[PDB]
Amino acid sequence: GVNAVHWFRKGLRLHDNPALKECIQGADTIRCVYILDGINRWRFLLQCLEDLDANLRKLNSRLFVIRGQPADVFPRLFKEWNITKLSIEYDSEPFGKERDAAIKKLATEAGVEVIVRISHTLYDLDKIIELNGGQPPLTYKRFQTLVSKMEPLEMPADTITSDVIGKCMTPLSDDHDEKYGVPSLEELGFDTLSSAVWPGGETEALTRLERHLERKARMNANSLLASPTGLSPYLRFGCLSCRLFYFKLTDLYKKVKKNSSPPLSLYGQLLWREFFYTAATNNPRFDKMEGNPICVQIPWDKNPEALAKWAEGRTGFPWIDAIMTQLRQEGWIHHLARHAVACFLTRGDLWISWEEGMKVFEELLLDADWSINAGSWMWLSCSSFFQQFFHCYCPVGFGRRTDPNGDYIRRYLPVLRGFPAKYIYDPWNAPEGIQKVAKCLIGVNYPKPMVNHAEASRLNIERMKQIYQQL
């Protein structure tokens, strides 16, 4: 008698799920569980779980959602259900490893075989680190070189279908909706908001992938807005398999461009994601400055007033404030906009730790998990990965060059809708008569800029230089 449990954490999908596929094989019963320990991230999650539950329902099964801590939950589940097999998608993240090692111990005690399969990343990250001699690579270029030395990527596992399940079944009681149902936002305590710009789930992910490949078959102002074929949140939650994406990308290139040796540039989004997971996996202090062996020690200031102005879009720099408003409202911003607000907060203008901007993004950004968010923030503040710090993004000019008309500003900061393009990125320079026509007095209706960028950035660039030896 083989009673199996698959434990969803990431990998919130039925396609390319090797762990769930292996767990079902030879099983007499299967139950899939999700254990629930910023409003936009919670909504996306719950929408992923609703979609998972729906698709399981098509297979005469159901998702089992449980509120609690895994170490306090699984031993009683093992006992009641007489479990002999538990499957998980491998989690490279350091605190995920530690959680999963505790569960593996509990599982062995209960006589439960633990199935673990890699499918959140393109590669076995431990193999990359071994090829590099026991440390992760500290430059992106070195990482790409190592990747080119890996064996060819694993093909996606077969999708879980009725045929796959076979005679394996799921016991269900009439009170499943009450006992094991996906909670609502209200039920978590949220005051609920218009429909999400980024709807969660595998079903959404797969249609987006197709249209993304069709479109793929150049920056501009429109790139700042959420794309209906954007894929990054679905990759972070596991709604979309990165290996399916990679394989589809390769196949399309070969058909369209008649070549079977594509560039590494083709997978740039996927590989930068892989780079940060590799860097993070053996470093439990990856998300800190102090005690983090790869992070340059930089004397950031503590400044809660300034941090709050940045976090809340009240800096008085419209380009910065609009980005942080779009982020709070919708949960995604363009990678160039991340550069802008990360440099402003850290090395550029406010000289505040990347750890504090990381905390804000963790609450708000749909595609930022522990490894990606920490790695990204160290990258953008020039704290690791040998990033260049001699240039500082201009919190007026970069936006003016990205959206010269200023529509993005007017869109996310309606209080500034009345300014002409001439002043939309620097409204403090607008004559009083313009401010009156705009019905926005700078310093009253919209804050004046919190710093003198030319002066602050000049000093911060010199200060960063003087950290290192002069030659």
Number of domains, the chain: 3
How many secondary structure helices (H) and strands (E) does the chain include? 23, 5
Which of helix, strand or coil describes residue 333? coil
Q: According to the annotation, is 232 in a ligand binding site?
A: yes
Which whole-number Å values give the CA distances from 419 to 326, 397, 402, 403, 445, in the listed order?
19, 17, 18, 14, 13
Q: Going by DSSP bridges, is the β-strand pair 29-36/3-8 parallel, antiparallel, or unpaired?
A: parallel
Same domain? 239 vs 138:
yes
Domain that holds residue 471: 284-471
Same domain? 347 vs 440:
yes
Which of helix, strand or coil describes residue 5? strand
Which CATH number fits the domain that encloses residue 46? Answer: 3.40.50.620
Same domain? 40 vs 80:
yes
Q: In this structure, what is the dihedral angle of CA atoms 4, 10, 14, 18, given to the nearest 10 degrees?
A: -60
Q: According to the annotation, is 120 in a ligand binding site?
A: no
* CA–centroid distance for 25 within its chain: 32
Which CATH number fits the domain that encloses residue 390? Answer: 1.10.579.10
For residue 338, give every residue at least 6 positions away whose Cβ sits within 8 Å of its Cβ, in sequence order, or none. 376, 380
- Assess contact for 320 and 331: CB atoms under 8 A: no
- Assess contact for 185 and 44: CB atoms under 8 A: no
Same domain? 215 vs 341:
no
Considering the domain boundaries, does residue 173 fall inside one?
no
Same domain? 276 vs 304:
no
- Count of alpha carbons within 13 Å of 318, Cβ hemisphere only? 30
C-alpha–C-alpha distance, residues 273 and 278, integer Å: 9
Q: What is the resolution of this structure in A?
A: 2.0
Considering the domain boundaries, does residue 187 fall inside one?
no
Torsion angles phi and psi, residue 4, rounded to 5: -115, 150
C-alpha–C-alpha distance, residues 463 and 369, integer Å: 30
Which whole-number Å values give the CA distances from 461 to 226, 344, 390, in the listed order?
32, 12, 7
- Assess contact for 66 and 36: CB atoms under 8 A: yes
Which of helix, strand or coil describes residue 241? coil
For residue 460, give every residue at least 6 positions away whose Cβ sits within 8 Å of its Cβ, in sequence order, or none. 347, 348, 349, 351, 392
Q: According to the annotation, is 297 in a ligand binding site?
A: no
- Assess contact for 247 and 60: CB atoms under 8 A: no
What are the tokens at 54? 């729906």
Which residue among 283, 302, 324 closes a domain?
283
Q: According to the annotation, is 61 in a ligand binding site?
A: no
Considering the domain boundaries, does residue 190 fall inside one?
no
Same domain? 144 vs 38:
no
For residue 443, give every residue at least 6 positions away whose Cβ sits within 8 Å of its Cβ, in sequence order, or none. none
What are the tokens at 392? 């500082």
Same domain? 290 vs 395:
yes
- Count of alpha carbons within 13 Å of 267, Cβ hemisphere only? 25
Strand partners, 115: 87
DSSP one-letter code for 23: H
What are the tokens at 219? 């920056």
Burial 106-133 (b: 16+ CB within 10 A, else e): bbeebebebbebbbbbbbebeebbeebe
Instruction: Give a three-class secondary structure readout of 305-318.
Output: HHHHHHHCCCCCCH
Considering the domain boundaries, does residue 14 fall inside one?
yes
Considering the domain boundaries, does residue 466 fall inside one?
yes
Burial 245-255 (b: 16+ CB within 10 A, else e): bbbbbeebbee
Which CATH number fits the domain that encloses residue 235? Answer: 1.25.40.80
Considering the domain boundaries, does residue 184 fall inside one?
no
- Assess contact for 7 and 43: CB atoms under 8 A: no
C-alpha–C-alpha distance, residues 98 and 47, integer Å: 27
Which residue among 250, 283, 316 closes a domain?
283
Q: According to the annotation, is 368 in a ligand binding site?
A: yes
Same domain? 73 vs 146:
no
C-alpha–C-alpha distance, residues 46 and 50, integer Å: 6
What are the tokens at 25? 């094989």
- Assess contact for 173 and 165: CB atoms under 8 A: no
Torsion angles phi and psi, residue 425, rounded to 5: -95, -10
Which residue among 256, 283, 310 closes a domain?
283
DSSP string, 83-139: --EEEEE---SHHHHHHHHHHHHHHHHTT-EEEEE--SSSS-HHHHHHHTTSS--SS
Q: Tell me what percent of the chain is helix, strand and coil, each rounded to the nearest 5.
A: 50, 5, 40
Considering the domain boundaries, does residue 176 fall inside one?
no
Beta-carbon count within 10 A of 63 CB: 23
- Assess contact for 6 and 101: CB atoms under 8 A: no
Q: According to the annotation, is 205 in a ligand binding site?
A: no
Same domain? 289 vs 261:
no
Same domain? 470 vs 430:
yes
Same domain? 229 vs 209:
yes
- Assess contact for 292 and 286: CB atoms under 8 A: yes
Breaks (C-N over 2.5 A) in the chain follow: 37, 192, 217
Same domain? 463 vs 336:
yes
Considering the domain boundaries, does residue 464 fall inside one?
yes
Residue ranges of the alpha helices (H) in 313-369? 318-330, 335-343, 354-364
